[PDB]
Design a protein around this ligand. Sequence first.
Ligand SMILES: [Mg+2]
Ligand SMILES: [Mg+2]
Length: 222
Amino acid sequence: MDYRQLHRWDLPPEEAIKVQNELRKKIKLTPYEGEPEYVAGVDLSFPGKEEGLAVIVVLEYPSFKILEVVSERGEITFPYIPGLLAFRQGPLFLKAWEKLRTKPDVVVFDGQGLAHPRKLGIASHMGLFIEIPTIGVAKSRLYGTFKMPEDKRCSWSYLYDGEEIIGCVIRTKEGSAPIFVSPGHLMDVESSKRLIKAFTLPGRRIPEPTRLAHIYTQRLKK
Ligand SMILES: [Mg+2]
Ligand SMILES: [Mg+2]
């Protein structure tokens, strides 16, 4: 698939932060109504060290049948810094994205989108590059305040930055920790909540797109 190279990747962390502040102006939080036909999930691994692995899985919806898997291996050159995940994982994702032949209607990332100190998590940032609706689904909080939802399945709370809503916290699985859902690009809070709920099977904590991407991350270990 094609994409837009909006800036260079070889940046020190200070310049990388400045780049996020310019890009946040381009995000469009628009509703995503209706149901998607194809849904991509994205996951990364770091087998041993000095060899990253990016996996993209494309599924049919609502069946969740797997239509395509692509993978890319490459060197990781930028440290993990919370809030700068895209600068570590973005380049390898985009090399995998180039090989993708099936165009997804929505792409789900393992990480935040809007629920980010500069409103531009990896889901939002990659959404600007690929120009497809995106959602970030994270297993822990990076940014924002909330009250813990009830322990019943499908209970949920909004994630806040002051007065503004930046995502939601969903108890997808009773007796498990909730997930943190936020829109990326071409996505809003209500639609990302509706879609991740429809992507999550009963009895499972993680939505099918990123759960299956994570599974291939482990099965495609070199
Ligand atoms: Mg952690
Ligand atoms: Mg994973």
